[PDB]
Design a protein around this ligand. Sequence first.
Ligand SMILES: Nc1nc2c(ncn2[C@@H]2O[C@H](COP(=O)(O)OP(=O)(O)OP(O)(O)=S)[C@@H](O)[C@H]2O)c(=O)[nH]1
Ligand SMILES: [Mg+2]
Length: 171
Amino acid sequence: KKALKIVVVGDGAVGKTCLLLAFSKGEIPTAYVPTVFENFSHVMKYKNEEFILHLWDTAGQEEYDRLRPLSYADSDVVLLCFAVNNRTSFDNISTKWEPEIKHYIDTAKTVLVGLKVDLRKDGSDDVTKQEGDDLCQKLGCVAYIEASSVAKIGLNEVFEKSVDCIFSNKP
Ligand SMILES: Nc1nc2c(ncn2[C@@H]2O[C@H](COP(=O)(O)OP(=O)(O)OP(O)(O)=S)[C@@H](O)[C@H]2O)c(=O)[nH]1
Ligand SMILES: [Mg+2]
């Protein structure tokens, strides 16, 4: 079985837990509960095979900074998550998240994921697709993908690209 460990990191409340649950279960939590950590195992049928995804959920809050590195060992892919309506979370990718990840698991491939894309509107300085593409280039991510756990947009694409960058026949 082709398996991989995918870890999700990013500011508090960007939508990390909802991403994993909307992807793997097809529905999100009715009540928002901040994560300490959580590990899921999910079978995804893709390209005529079944892949075992070990999904590692982490705490976006800095109160848990000391604990989070405990989740990074042997990570195949890291999802650098921000919410497109929270520019601070976007900026924090470059200053906090990508560096933290490159410190503890520099061998993992990174995927930039712009969450809550359902909330994006002109005239509020939301993170645009171009900005995400620019950052993906700057940080050397495999891709920038936009998603909404609520509207069910881009969910499979996040995890298909995660599988691809590890097991595919091409970049
Ligand atoms: N509109 C919209 N709201 C979302 C979306 N994803 C998550 N949310 C909401 O944002 C809030 C935080 O989502 P959640 O997934 O729990 O954040 P988190 O990144 O896991 O937060 P933490 O555990 O590190 S504190 C919740 O109220 C959730 O319903 C989305 O795609 N669109
Ligand atoms: Mg969470």
